[PDB]
Amino acid sequence: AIDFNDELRNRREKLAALRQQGVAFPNDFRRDHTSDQLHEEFDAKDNQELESLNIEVSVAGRMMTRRIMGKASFVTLQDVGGRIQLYVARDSLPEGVYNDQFKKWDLGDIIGARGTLFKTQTGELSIHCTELRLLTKALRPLPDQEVRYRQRYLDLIANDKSRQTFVVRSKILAAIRQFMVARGFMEVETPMMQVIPGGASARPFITHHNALDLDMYLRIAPELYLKRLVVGGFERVFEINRNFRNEGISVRHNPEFTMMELYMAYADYHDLIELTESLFRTLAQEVLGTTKVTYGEHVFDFGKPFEKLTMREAIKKYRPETDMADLDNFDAAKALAESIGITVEKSWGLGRIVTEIFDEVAEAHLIQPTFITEYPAEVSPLARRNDVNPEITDRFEFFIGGREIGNGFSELNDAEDQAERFQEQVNAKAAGDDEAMFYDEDYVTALEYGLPPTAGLGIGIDRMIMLFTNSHTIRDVILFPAMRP
């Protein structure tokens, strides 16, 4: 109880003493190895080899454990690569260091050491220190379950599983770039501040640029800019960056999230389906070492094709008692939708209602990697219209673990059609839809110069990271998740 406050007092008093001796916070010690490197290279050698090899190394990190056994002590040092053992002896270090310094330090303190490698009796790699210093005094002792997100630094210091998740996240992004670049895609950077937001249907965050006295929006998606680049000639482009949506926090929603959008000219959604399946198979293999991934109580085989259903088949499959003819009549669909709890807004049309039914009925059940095709035109203002049925577009979305992971389609390169769909969106907004798109005249103009037939795909990177790290909340894969005040 008060033992924590005495820890704080003791640390402040120890620091006060450092201040009297000179510069309490130096920046001089230099290491030449991290724990992971030492283990990788020497774990395999026995004390005989290490003895004859007589290798001296320098490390630095946090003092996680210390066991003082008189004139000798054993310490666990934790650095960016992991942990390494230190053997600290009074007569191995310079005079007075052991008793006047080392013993006065505290767990959590950042220290630096230089010594010779050897293996303990237990067979562990250890460093027989010949030099040891205090680099940074820790004024606070080593660390709801919301603290993990409120003070991510404590979570990273304490939980190796959490560290691993974020290291894997970095590995995945690097692997995605390598995968895309290998296919001739070029990474670009489009605006995050837009006067006219678009590319998706969402409530945007709004701000003000004083210099131009201009109201602006944080981008909800880079889609319209990326397609402008394809018109410009960058026929294989991708962007992996933040999107912002003014909506509430959830187990799979963060106000700002990372997404990858890619566009490849002279391709259709079928090509995106193949790319998606290859990306997941490649990432699982390259990053996890296997194509079979364990997530919760399930196993995803990214080595076999994703399942594929139309939106209606998914609805019929998860609500078998559904009279499919109901989805063809506005009144029947509206009634059906409401019967299952969906509040049908005045602006909604049949296509929107059917899509909403799909969300309510099937989304949660798409556990194994699944592609859902035939999205209604009403909810896809930027997607290419299907050749045989104009009411649907050549678009799909894919789900894994009951969550939507991606969205893709053959792009709409028909300027006149696009302008009309933008007008419908404007009417919708006027009829109450706060997520309807804004009319973008310059985008239409770009399409008039000519956009090659193209296929674009958007993938939620955070949602994807969850599947590769067995995380069941998006808050576990975002270093600093948005939190309630």
Ligand X SMILES: N[C@@H](CCCC[NH3+])C(=O)O
| Tokens (6 digits) for 433 | 């839809």
How far apart (Å, rounded) are the C-alpha atoms in residues 2 and 263? 60
Query: From the CB of 373, what's the least distance to a second copy, in Å?
Result: 15
Asked if 14 and 76 touch (Cβ cutoff 8 Å), the reply is no
How far apart (Å, rounded) are the C-alpha atoms in residues 330 and 336? 10
How far apart (Å, rounded) are the C-alpha atoms in residues 104 and 68? 11
In terms of CB distance, is 401 or 458 closer to ligand X?
458
How far apart (Å, rounded) are the C-alpha atoms in residues 300 and 467? 9
DSSP class per residue in 195-235: SS--SS--PPPEEEETTTTEEEEE-S-SHHHHHHHHHHT--
In terms of CB distance, is 203 or 292 closer to a second copy?
203
Query: From the CB of 303, what's the least distance to a second copy, in Å?
Result: 26
Which residues, 407 to 436, sit near ligand X by CB under 6 A?
Answer: 407-409, 411
Which residues, 196 to 215, sit near ligand X by CB under 6 A?
Answer: 199-200
Of the residues 42, 458, 461, 471, which one makes contact with ligand X according to CB under 6 A: 458
How far apart (Å, rounded) are the C-alpha atoms in residues 1 and 8? 12
How far apart (Å, rounded) are the C-alpha atoms in residues 349 and 331? 10
Of the residues 198, 381, 406, 481, which one makes contact with ligand ATP according to CB under 6 A: 406
Label residue 108 left, alpha or beta by phi (over 0 means left) and psi (-120 to 50 means alpha).
left
Which strand ranges, in their side-by-side order, compose the sheet holding 403-410? 186-187, 236-244, 256-265, 454-460, 403-410, 392-400, 370-376, 307-310
How far apart (Å, rounded) are the C-alpha atoms in residues 422 and 444? 9
In the list Mn ion, ligand ATP, a second copy, none, the entry touching 413 (Cβ below 5 to 8 angstroms by class) is a second copy
Of the residues 235, 239, 261, 462, which one makes contact with ligand X according to CB under 6 A: 261
How far apart (Å, rounded) are the C-alpha atoms in residues 52 and 44? 15
Q: From the CB of residue 116, how many other CB atoms can be counted at a distance below 10 Å?
A: 18
**Per-position b or e across 254-285, b if 16+ CB within 10 A of its CB:** bebbbbbbbbbbebbbeebbebbbebbbbbbe
Query: From the CB of 185, what's the least distance to ligand X, in Å?
Result: 14
In the list ligand ATP, Mn ion, ligand X, none, the entry touching 223 (Cβ below 5 to 8 angstroms by class) is ligand X
Which residues, 379 to 408, sit near ligand X by CB under 6 A?
Answer: 382, 407-408
Phi, then psi, of 396 in degrees rounded to 5: -145, 170
How far apart (Å, rounded) are the C-alpha atoms in residues 426 and 222? 20
404 labeled part of a ligand binding site: yes
Query: From the CB of 357, what's the least distance to ligand ATP, in Å?
Result: 14
Work out the end-to-end distance of the chain between its first and last CA atoms, rounded to an integer number of angstroms. 26
Of the residues 259, 283, 446, 457, which one makes contact with ligand ATP according to CB under 6 A: 259
In the list ligand ATP, ligand X, a second copy, none, the entry touching 268 (Cβ below 5 to 8 angstroms by class) is a second copy
How far apart (Å, rounded) are the C-alpha atoms in residues 485 and 188? 35
Of the residues 148, 245, 316, 385, which one makes contact with ligand ATP according to CB under 6 A: 245
In terms of CB distance, is 15 or 202 closer to Mn ion?
202
In terms of CB distance, is 74 or 295 closer to ligand ATP?
295
In terms of CB distance, is 42 or 263 closer to ligand X?
263
Of the residues 200, 216, 336, 379, which one makes contact with ligand ATP according to CB under 6 A: 200
How far apart (Å, rounded) are the C-alpha atoms in residues 145 and 138? 23
Which residues, 170 to 199, sit near ligand X by CB under 6 A?
Answer: 199
In the list Mn ion, a second copy, ligand ATP, none, the entry touching 455 (Cβ below 5 to 8 angstroms by class) is a second copy
Amino acid identity at 350: L
441 labeled part of a ligand binding site: no
DSSP code for 183: T
Q: Which stretch binds ligand ATP (CB under 6 A): 41-49, 111-119, 245-253, 303-311?
A: 245-253
Of the residues 221, 327, 405, 478, which one makes contact with ligand X according to CB under 6 A: 221
Query: From the CB of 127, what's the least distance to ligand ATP, in Å?
Result: 39
Residue of 191, 265, 222, 186 lying closest to 451 (CA atoms): 265
In the list ligand X, Mn ion, a second copy, none, the entry touching 404 (Cβ below 5 to 8 angstroms by class) is Mn ion
In terms of CB distance, is 37 or 368 closer to a second copy?
37
Which residues, 295 to 314, sit near ligand X by CB under 6 A?
Answer: none
Q: By rule CB under 6 A, what string of x and - marks binding of each residue 50-89 to ligand ATP?
A: ----------------------------------------
Does 31 interact with ligand ATP (rule: CB under 6 A)?
no
Query: From the CB of 414, what's the least distance to a second copy, in Å?
Result: 5
Query: From the CB of 448, what's the least distance to a second copy, in Å?
Result: 4
Contacts of 34 (CB under 8 A, 6+ apart): 59, 79, 80, 81, 82
In terms of CB distance, is 112 or 199 closer to ligand ATP?
199
Does 351 interact with ligand X (rule: CB under 6 A)?
no
Residues of the shown chain interacting with ligand X in the complex, contacts defined by CB under 6 A: 199-200, 221, 223, 261, 382, 407-409, 411, 456-458
Q: Which residues are annotated as a binding site for Mg(2+)?
A: 397, 404
Residues of the shown chain interacting with ligand ATP in the complex, contacts defined by CB under 6 A: 200, 245, 252-254, 257, 259, 404-407, 458, 460, 462-463, 474
